[PDB]
Amino acid sequence: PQITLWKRPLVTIKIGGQLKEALLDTGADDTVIEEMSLPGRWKPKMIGGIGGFIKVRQYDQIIIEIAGHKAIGTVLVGPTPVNIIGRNLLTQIGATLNF
């Protein structure tokens, strides 16, 4: 689809069998999801945003549906205020910015 930006670009995602809402975020390198359980091992990562840095859990090779498109890649879990779909997965669904 085409998504205009008058409203937040929120879409439904499905991860771990659960539906969640997430923001399509071209300003995020990385996908970051609020606290939840995921399978497998995780690795540490620190990511930085407007207010400073947070510690997250990095899970690789996680299956995630985004707006009906299937992605498999890295998901960071931690105290993000909102679920954000970053460029690592926006590229897997073929998203571009156009003007």
User: What is the contact mask toward Na ion in residues 46 to 65, using x (rule: CB under 5 A)?
Assistant: --------------xx----
Q: How far apart are CA 84 and CA 40, in angstroms?
A: 21
DSSP symbol at 13: E
* Joined tokens for residue 39: 């399978």
Rule CB under 6 A: say whether 90 interacts with ligand G52: no
Rule CB under 5 A: say whether 44 interacts with Na ion: no
Structure-token match 């498999």, residue found: 72
Size of the site for Na ion (CB under 5 A): 3
- 37, 58, 88 from 15: Cα distances, Å: 10, 15, 16
Question: Rounded to the nearest whole angstrom, what is the least distance from the CB of residue 22 to a second copy in the complex?
Answer: 10
Stretch that binds ligand G52, among 11-19, 59-67, 79-87, 90-98 (CB under 6 A): 79-87
User: Catalytic residue positions?
Assistant: 25
